[PDB]
Amino acid sequence: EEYRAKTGYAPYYAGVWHSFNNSNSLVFRWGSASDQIAQWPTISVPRGELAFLRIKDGKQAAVGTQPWRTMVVWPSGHGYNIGIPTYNAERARQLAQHLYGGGSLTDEKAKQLFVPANQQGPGKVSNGNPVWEVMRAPLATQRAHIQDFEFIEAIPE
Amino acid sequence: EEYRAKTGYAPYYAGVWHSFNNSNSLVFRWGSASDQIAQWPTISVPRGELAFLRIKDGKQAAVGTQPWRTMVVWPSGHGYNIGIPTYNAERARQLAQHLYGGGSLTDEKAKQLFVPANQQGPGKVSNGNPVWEVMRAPLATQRAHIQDFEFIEAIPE
Amino acid sequence: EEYRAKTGYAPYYAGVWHSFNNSNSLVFRWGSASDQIAQWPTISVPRGELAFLRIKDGKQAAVGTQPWRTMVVWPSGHGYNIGIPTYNAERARQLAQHLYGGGSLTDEKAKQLFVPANQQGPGKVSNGNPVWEVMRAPLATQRAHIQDFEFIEAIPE
Amino acid sequence: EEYRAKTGYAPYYAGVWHSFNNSNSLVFRWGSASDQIAQWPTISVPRGELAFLRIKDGKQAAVGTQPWRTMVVWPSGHGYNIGIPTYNAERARQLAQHLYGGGSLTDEKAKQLFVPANQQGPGKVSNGNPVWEVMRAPLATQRAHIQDFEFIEAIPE
Numbered sequence: 169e170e171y172r173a174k175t176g177y178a179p180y181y182a183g184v185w186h187s188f189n190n191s192n193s194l195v196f197r198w199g200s201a202s203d204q205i206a207q208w209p210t211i212s213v214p215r216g217e218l219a220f221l222r223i224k225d226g227k228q229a230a231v232g233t234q235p236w237r238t239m240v241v242w243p244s245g246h247g248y249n250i251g252i253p254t255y256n257a258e259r260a261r262q263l264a265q266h267l268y269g270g271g272s273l274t275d276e277k278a279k280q281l282f283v284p285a286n287q288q289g290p291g292k293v294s295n296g297n298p299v300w301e302v303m304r305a306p307l308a309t310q311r312a313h314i315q316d317f318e319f320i321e322a323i324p325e
Numbered sequence: 326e327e328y329r330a331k332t333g334y335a336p337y338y339a340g341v342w343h344s345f346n347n348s349n350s351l352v353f354r355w356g357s358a359s360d361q362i363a364q365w366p367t368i369s370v371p372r373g374e375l376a377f378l379r380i381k382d383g384k385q386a387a388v389g390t391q392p393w394r395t396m397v398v399w400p401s402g403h404g405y406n407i408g409i410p411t412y413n414a415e416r417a418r419q420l421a422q423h424l425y426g427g428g429s430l431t432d433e434k435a436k437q438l439f440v441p442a443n444q445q446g447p448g449k450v451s452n453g454n455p456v457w458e459v460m461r462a463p464l465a466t467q468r469a470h471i472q473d474f475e476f477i478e479a480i481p482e
Numbered sequence: 483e484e485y486r487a488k489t490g491y492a493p494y495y496a497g498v499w500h501s502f503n504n505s506n507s508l509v510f511r512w513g514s515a516s517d518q519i520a521q522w523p524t525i526s527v528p529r530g531e532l533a534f535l536r537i538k539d540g541k542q543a544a545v546g547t548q549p550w551r552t553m554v555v556w557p558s559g560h561g562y563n564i565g566i567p568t569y570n571a572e573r574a575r576q577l578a579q580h581l582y583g584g585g586s587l588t589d590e591k592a593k594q595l596f597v598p599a600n601q602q603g604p605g606k607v608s609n610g611n612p613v614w615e616v617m618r619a620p621l622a623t624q625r626a627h628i629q630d631f632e633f634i635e636a637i638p639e
Numbered sequence: 640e641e642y643r644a645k646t647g648y649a650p651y652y653a654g655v656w657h658s659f660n661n662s663n664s665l666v667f668r669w670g671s672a673s674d675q676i677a678q679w680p681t682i683s684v685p686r687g688e689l690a691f692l693r694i695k696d697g698k699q700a701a702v703g704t705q706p707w708r709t710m711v712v713w714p715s716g717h718g719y720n721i722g723i724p725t726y727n728a729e730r731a732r733q734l735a736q737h738l739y740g741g742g743s744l745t746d747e748k749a750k751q752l753f754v755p756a757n758q759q760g761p762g763k764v765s766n767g768n769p770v771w772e773v774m775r776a777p778l779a780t781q782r783a784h785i786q787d788f789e790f791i792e793a794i795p796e
Binding site for chain 2 (some may be wrong): 528529630632635
């Protein structure tokens with residue numbers, strides 16, 4: 169509805185962090201100092217779906233070698249969600265598929281979908297705290313064993 | 326502990342049934358008439374495990390082209406569990422892996438692990454209602470999405 | 483977004499059905515003949531939430547002793563979801579709480595939240611297939627045991 | 640089958656720990672020094688069951704104001720399971736009901752089922768690492784909402 173960074177954690181730029189893929193990939197930061205990492209709300213996502221973000225107005229996006237118009241939001245492992253920019257919506261959809269599909273940020277499949285540190289460029293900040301559209305899609309989900317012959321059901325895509 | 330057929334559903338022999346793979350595969354029957362299919366207790370199995378059965382004394386087993394010493398028990402779709410013999414423990418373990426792993430009796434992978442109808446042979450019955458050992462093993466299990474960033478965890482094998 | 487009855491299942495009126503509380507309570511019907519019961523889409527609802535419906539324009543509602551402006555949608559047990567009107571939003575919220583909380587349409591707590599058959603009145607139909615707002619709320623949810631010491635977490639309200 | 644403390648964590652006595660109810664309740668310790676707390680294996684428990692422990696030979700039990708013949712094993716919050724003695728099997732069953740039912744060691748209901756620190760008495764150690772019987776029982780379990788109209792089922796007691 170009105171998806172943006174938690175209040176105060178904007179403007180932000182895409183930079184690097186030793187606690188996100190050992191400083192090798194871009195993540196949104198609200199400052200240049202120790203652990204000034206932008207924090208993001210948890211999107212309500214039901215089993216059988218995914219979500220990623222696409223900024224409503226690209227002119228308001230943070231800028232590296234390009235405007236960062238698409239991203240995936242995921243737990244950092246440090247008690248809040250981080251925003252991970254991607255090159256485009258296709259990559260964002262593929263990263264969300266991996267993570268909502270059961271994957272981890274430390275998986276090679278995830279790492280290869282991040283934007284590398286050498287794309288930071290000028291590290292320009294966003295225009296304020298702009299609104300992103302929550303992009304939702306069905307996600308193919310397998311049966312999961314619970315107990316005896318009880319399973320939670322598959323969801324086709 | 327004392328695994329055997331539900332009381333009354335023994336002696337049984339391995340025969341065929343139009344409601345189990347269209348009469349093409351062996352399933353334990355307690356009679357030759359309409360839907361006289363042996364019924365079996367539900368083994369208590371936690372998420373992350375499987376179970377199959379291996380008869381304690383092979384001399385007591387039902388006999389087709391061989392003594393039926395190993396089987397997998399699974400819901401029939403008709404309100405009770407059926408007993409599906411296999412050629413050996415390896416096949417039983419592979420069928421249990423498939424089913425407790427989320428598969429279905431109508432899957433080609435499952436069908437290829439059943440014993441074909443042409444192995445019915447004399448269709449000799451078991452010696453009474455003999456005891457089977459419950460064979461338990463860990464089963465590799467993937468993360469399963471529940472809601473938002475919540476997953477039920479993987480279990481290694 | 484555009485919640486309404488599945489196409490063709492409108493206009494509808496609130497009447498009775500032998501397969502919903504033995505004809506004692508109102509349910510939306512698209513005709514007077516055998517099992518002409520209106521069918522409704524499944525709302526996407528994540529664990530930890532509920533949903534009920536409130537018609538956007540009351541003038542378009544089906545009419546009994548009052549305009550039926552609020553309802554809960556739930557599986558009928560016959561392969562589709564039925565629409566169950568309530569007297570007001572408070573009752574609808576209480577019925578959704580009961581059902582998304584794990585209850586059943588045959589529970590006394592649910593039955594007492596239905597509208598009784600004697601409120602059918604003229605049984606006037608809706609104006610076409612009008613749009614309802616999907617009313618969402620958090621729903622207090624308890625921990626649920628999965629295996630060993632693993633639980634899916636509580637969600638506060 | 641052969642339930643006992645992890646190797647090396649025996650003999651043990653029932654003493655106190657600042658990280659278990661602020662030193663107010665008994666927990667098995669394998670030494671008197673910093674965090675020398677006995678560690679215990681995870682019992683395989685499926686959804687819909689509980690487990691607690693009853694020592695096979697009481698003469699081998701640790702001794703306070705009484706032989707500690709019954710206990711519940713639960714995660715400590717510090718990366719291993721602790722063993723919590725109870726006065727008798729009834730209390731152990733009630734504590735296991737609470738915890739496998741979704742409760743926490745910090746709940747007042749749990750705290751009131753622990754043995755108080757003033758029952759430590761001589762703090763005598765067990766005879767080696769004795770075997771406990773794993774006592775299993777069904778545990779009444781409620782439906783749990785997963786997504787949309789999907790629930791994992793109740794299990795009666």
